[PDB]
Amino acid sequence: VSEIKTLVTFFGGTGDLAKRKLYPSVFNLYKKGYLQKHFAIVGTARQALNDDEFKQLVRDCIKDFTDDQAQAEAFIEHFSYRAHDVTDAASYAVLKEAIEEAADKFDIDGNRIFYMSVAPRFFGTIAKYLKSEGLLADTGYNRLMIEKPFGTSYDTAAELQNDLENAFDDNQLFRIDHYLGKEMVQNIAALRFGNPIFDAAWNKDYIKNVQVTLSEVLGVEERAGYYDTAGALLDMIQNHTMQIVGWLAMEKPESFTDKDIRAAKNAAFNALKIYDEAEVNKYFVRAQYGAGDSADFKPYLEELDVPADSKNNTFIAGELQFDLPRWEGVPFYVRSGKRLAAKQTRVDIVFKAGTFNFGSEQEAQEAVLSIIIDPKGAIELKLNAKSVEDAFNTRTIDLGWTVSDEDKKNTPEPYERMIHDTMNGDGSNFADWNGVSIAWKFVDAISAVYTADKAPLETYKSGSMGPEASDKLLAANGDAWVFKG
Amino acid sequence: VSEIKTLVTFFGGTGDLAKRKLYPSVFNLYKKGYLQKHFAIVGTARQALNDDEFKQLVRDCIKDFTDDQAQAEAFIEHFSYRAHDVTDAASYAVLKEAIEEAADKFDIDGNRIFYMSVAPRFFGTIAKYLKSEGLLADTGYNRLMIEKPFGTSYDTAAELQNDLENAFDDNQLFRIDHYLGKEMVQNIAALRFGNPIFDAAWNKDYIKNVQVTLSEVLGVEERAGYYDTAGALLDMIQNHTMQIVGWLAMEKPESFTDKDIRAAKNAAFNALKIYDEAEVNKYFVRAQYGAGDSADFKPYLEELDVPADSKNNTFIAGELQFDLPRWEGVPFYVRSGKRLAAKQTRVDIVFKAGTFNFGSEQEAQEAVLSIIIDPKGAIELKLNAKSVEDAFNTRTIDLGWTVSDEDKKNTPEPYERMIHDTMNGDGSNFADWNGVSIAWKFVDAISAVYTADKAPLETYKSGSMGPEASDKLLAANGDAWVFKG
């Protein structure tokens, strides 16, 4: 494989994300051979660490993935560290020098990546300074990887965006959503555009409805401080869920390049219907988990650091609608929540049942294409066939496929994908501004009615699949969730 | 279950088919509760057997199909036997009498089924006398189950047809082909018409070619006497293969009633291209098996009873063409033979590859839907998805399904399915005159050039999938056998 020549600077280089996700990913790119001699990693944070202490930190964080000592040592010598106060303009001069020193040491020509893994208050500030203090390279590329969240409403986001646009063009910005980095999620376009039988049926004439489910068995754990102000709505729906929908609802692109893909996705989002108060009430459900069946499952209000009057949503179920011919009348059902029956990230495409009557007791039911993303990749197709009875009758059978052991071992972890893609300058698995702005516009309309408490807050017992209102939502259209736990 | 009131007479009631399959099947119908009290089975052959030894013959045969010995005995009590010579009109009175006795003893009002399980030469005769000697019931129905509808030649076949329509009404004729009775063959229509995504692609816009394979590992064994003049052409192609093609190539029927199904099938059969001499040479391959790698897999010309000059075909592969708008340009490849790599009856529908450019190393390949009929039922769908590599690329994966233990344990045997259907007077799974007629004309066109030795006789290693001329047939259209052995 060809060598990738880059200089990566991590803001927030001592946080857990960097320690357990980022460095090991970068190390993998090294093992694979993409990273060879012309590369350097400059870590930065507020604590007073130094080069020796940083290399040691890195060494410990990748010890579990090392083949041999020499390999780790060779890798480690490409890192350097600079303590740095993101608000201090002068501090940037120290960083600029570290970067230039590293660029000279390993002969790196531009190609800089700045990874922001710090509190979001600093996103705009760091951006402006990168330009001011002359940290941006004069040749090669300059790219910014921005960690979640990306604002907390359309306003904050737009504001963030405006700030970012001072030193970067939208196509150099890489907003991170690790679900877009999962292998199975990337199989969607292949399945659809690579098989005419599905490609031709990916529209309102064959699809009854689309279902997206991101369910977790865990509760609020120990992140109540942050979660209580975000809820399933901002933590799971606005970002992960919406971006998966984008892959599903997209129009057929001119070609498979990042530019056409985003264009194809943007056309769908532009057709997304934004709701008013009555509609949010009609099409969405918000709930909070109650007690379960064991002394481990406390109702949400009894969790650590959760205010006693909390009206936060730990579960959201809703219907999206697209004003594009392709999707006329096909509801996209979306759901995500904590304390549900199982851990599962999946997509289920329910096809309209056939009208040909066999004159049997059980006529043809709806076929279903299911793509399981988490916990283990699997694809299943529920099809109508003949029952094993004396009189002709139909039944539903499931053809299945699941990742092999070899598939698992060769699957790159999402952060490796993202970093590698950013190095290649491929925007295929990243959302662009148009996509993010629409998601915010859509979600704001919902939040607005929630904060004003203009919609019920349902309960559901820990261990189920949500409030009964969730089922009632699909029932109105003669639909039902295919995954029942 | 409802009790079925019927009287079934078996001509050839001491032959292998009766012993091994007919009797055990009727028994299954009894155990399942369809056959309760108002029923009788009258057997008949040349040999002078008495009620005791005949009942004993049935007992020996359903012995391993009985759980409770009591139900066995209770079943046995409904049988009666009469020695009878089919050619002597006089002895039909003995039969006629026996029939009436059993009818009055068990209170069966008409509803007679006559199963002709004897050599074909006798069918015409038995039919005429059934009407002549007044064996046909007064009230209820009268139905004929003809074991070998094709007869031994188009002429005799046509002749028998003549006799039958001049004495019986067509809805009383049940032309047998046990393959139509196989559970998986009956799933084909359910899969196609029961699923819009498949129903809509069942034509030339999506299908590249259809393959039908009926392979066997055994050689001629101890049937050289019959096989040497029949060959795979008459033994497997003319009958079983053709009936399967029928289910595949049929047009979409108006409804799922046997009348519309037959019309739909016939639209395909009448559109089948019958070949002249040049075309047989172009589209068909005949071959005879040579020695295998192992020891006792000797060449066909060395089997104990095969004449030195034998030019018999133990393998046929060919291309069928239907002149219907939905099948324009799609070849139907058929192959059947002895001493091939494995025992298998299956259909493989190859879909044209998509044309979407992913910009990958491996673009989309052809999807394939496979229906395994023997040894065990299975349905597989090879689809294009994403490979597990750093760069985006496609690969084919296989979604599969196979019959469960419960399914195969509740699956009726072909003969039970057929007898039951005849009782119900349902002709959907039986061959009709037009299909039988066409199959004959089709085959006779091929036999003519073969008996005139105007086409080559290929050789193939026993244990392989046939001569390479079989692969060349498909390669001419850029196709290849999916089943590799």
Which residue among B34, B364, B410 sits closest to A194, beta carbon to beta carbon? Answer: B364
Per the CB < 8 A criterion, the answer to whether B162 and B173 are in contact is no
| Structural tokens at position A297 | 């499952």
Rounded Cα distance between A367 and A395, Å, is 11
Which CATH architecture describes the domain B176-484?
2-Layer Sandwich (3.30)
Contacts of A35 in chain B (CB under 8 A): none
φ and ψ at A144, to 5 degrees? Answer: -120, 125
Active site residue A420: no
CA A44 to chain centre: 25
The whole-angstrom distance between residue A463's C-alpha and the CA centroid of its chain comes to 24
From A195, A386, A401, residue closest to B190, measured CB to CB:
A386
Q: How far is CA A325 from CA A203, A204, A263, A369, in A?
A: 8, 8, 17, 22
B311 among annotated binding-site residues: no
Domain B1-175 class? Answer: alpha beta
Catalytic: which of B78, B84, B240, B420?
Answer: B240
For testing contact with chain B, the best of A188, A383, A415 (most B CBs within 10 A): A383
> Rounded CA gap, A332 and A336, in Å?
14
Q: CA A440, A445, A447, A451: dihedral to nearest 10 degrees?
A: 140
CA distance B249 to B255: 16
Between A and B, how many residue pairs show a Cβ–Cβ distance under 8 A? 161
The residue whose two tokens read 């090294």 is A30
Which residues are CB-neighbours of B233 under 8 A, at least 6 positions away?
B286, B313, B316, B443, B446, B447, B450
* Contact criterion met (CB below 8 Å) for A304 and A435: no
Structure tokens at B177: 């082909």
What residue type is assigned to position A1 of the chain? V
Phi-psi region of B359 (alpha: psi -120 to 50; beta: other; left: phi over 0): left
CB spacing of A401 vs B399 below 8 angstroms: yes
Q: Assess contact for A204 and A329: CB atoms under 8 A.
A: yes
First to last CA, chain A: 43
Contact across the interface for B399 and A397, Cβ inside 8 Å: no
Contact flag B384-A206 (C-beta cutoff 8 Å)? no
Find which of B1, B192, B195 to mutate to test the A interface (most A CBs within 10 Å of its CB): B195
A195 CB neighbours in chain B (<8 A) are 351, 354, 364, 367, 383-384
Give me the residue spans of the domains in chain B. 1-175, 176-484
Q: Which amino acid is at B401?
A: W
Strands A142-146 and A112-116: what pairing? Answer: parallel
Best of B34, B251, B388, B393 to mutate (most A CBs within 10 Å, chain A): B388
Cβ of B359 within 8 Å of Cβ of A197? The answer is: no
Secondary structure element (H or E) that encloses residue B317, with its range: strand B315-320
Cα separation of B315 and B286, whole Å?
6
- Of the partner residues A206, A256, A386, the one whose CB lies closest to the CB of residue B196: A206
Radius of gyration of chain B (CA): 24
Is residue B444 a known part of a binding site? Answer: no
SS3 B205: coil
What is residue B155's three-state secondary structure? helix
Is residue B243 within 8 A of residue B366, CB to CB? The reply is no
Tell me the C-alpha distance between B112 and B142, whole Å.
5
CA pair distance A146, A390, nearest whole angstrom: 62
Q: State the binding site of A for NADP(+).
A: 12-19, 46, 85-86, 148
Q: How was this structure determined?
A: X-ray
Nearest to B394 by CA among B367, B356, B361, B368: B361
Q: Is B67 annotated as a binding residue?
A: no
HSE-CB at A379 with a 13 A cutoff on CA atoms is 25
CA distance B350 to chain A (A): 12
Of B199, B390, B406, nearest to A354 by CB-CB distance is B199
Measure the CA–CA gap between A247 and B211, rounded to whole angstroms.
Answer: 35
DSSP-derived 3-state class of residue B311:
coil
What amino acid occupies position A270?
Answer: N
